[PDB]
Design a protein around this ligand. Structure first.
Ligand SMILES: O=C(O)c1ccccc1[SeH]
Ligand SMILES: [Zn+2]
Length: 259
């Protein structure tokens, strides 16, 4: 399935035809109504252990760019909070807008941020990512909002390699990148059961959305918007507005880690 995207003729309103789960009971993203989310005093502390993370490569996949990690040992793991067991970091990517007033997938009281970072982790009890996405507890995604303001020093290494992966299918070596440089001070979060926000839209994700956004500069997000959805020697299509809008919450409760 090479067909879907974010255009008029292949974007989010069309996805249900090839991926009927698009209209399912636990789709993402959602609007987080802060007044309705309930503090859950039973959530255990969240543990984000990135000291031994080993980044390998950065890839333009025609939808976004992925910063990929070595997930063949327990090097960079997420556990605690709403999670049972140990989830290994496989990749991070972003979703962003053409304009600073849109780009996030989750919203907070209908507020849209300029972008959203997704750190994707898979449950080690399922052995590999492909097995994990078939299970209702297969993935844990840490979602972090981006606002435009001060630069994020720890993002600049990502920004500066984007020229080398301008078009679909281009990759570049991307070693020794430390994802701790992308985390806000507070790990206060909301959590709910949901899905991938891209086809195949599998209902395998425990979402952990941080309350505190990070800040990036106008120049940093401009470099995101100079990427291309197209392949090399194809007509230039700027990689912008690669976000899915909020989906129906249905029979779900959003829990808060904080009072
Ligand atoms: O599009 C992706 O790379 C993806 C993959 C896994 C979980 C969530 C997302 Se939204
Ligand atoms: Zn994503």
């Amino acid at each position: 399935s090479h067909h879907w995207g974010y255009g008029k003729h292949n974007g989010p309103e069309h996805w249900h035809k090839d991926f009927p789960i698009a209209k399912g009971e636990r789709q993402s993203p959602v609007d987080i109504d802060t007044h309705t989310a309930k503090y859950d005093p039973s959530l255990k502390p969240l543990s984000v252990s990135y000291d031994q993370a080993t980044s390998l490569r950065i890839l333009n996949n025609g939808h976004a760019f992925n910063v990929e990690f070595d997930d063949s040992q327990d090097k960079a793991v997420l556990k605690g909070g709403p999670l049972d067991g140990t989830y290994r970091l496989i990749q991070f990517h972003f979703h962003w807008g053409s304009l600073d007033g849109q780009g996030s997938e989750h919203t907070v009281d209908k507020k849209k941020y300029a972008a959203e970072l997704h750190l994707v982790h898979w449950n080690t009890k399922y052995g590999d990512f492909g097995k994990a996405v078939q299970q209702p507890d297969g993935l844990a995604v840490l979602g972090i909002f981006l606002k435009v303001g001060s630069a994020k020093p720890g993002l600049q290494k990502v920004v500066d390699v984007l020229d080398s992966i301008k078009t679909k299918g281009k990759s570049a070596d991307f070693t020794n990148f430390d994802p701790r440089g992308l985390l806000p001070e507070s790990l206060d979060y909301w959590t709910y059961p949901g899905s991938l926000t891209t086809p195949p839209l599998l209902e395998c994700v425990t979402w952990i959305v941080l309350k505190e956004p990070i800040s990036v500069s106008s120049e940093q997000v401009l470099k995101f918007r100079k990427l291309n959805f197209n392949g090399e020697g194809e007509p230039e299509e700027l990689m912008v507005d690669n976000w899915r809008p909020a989906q129906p919450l249905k029979n779900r409760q959003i829990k808060a880690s904080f009072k």
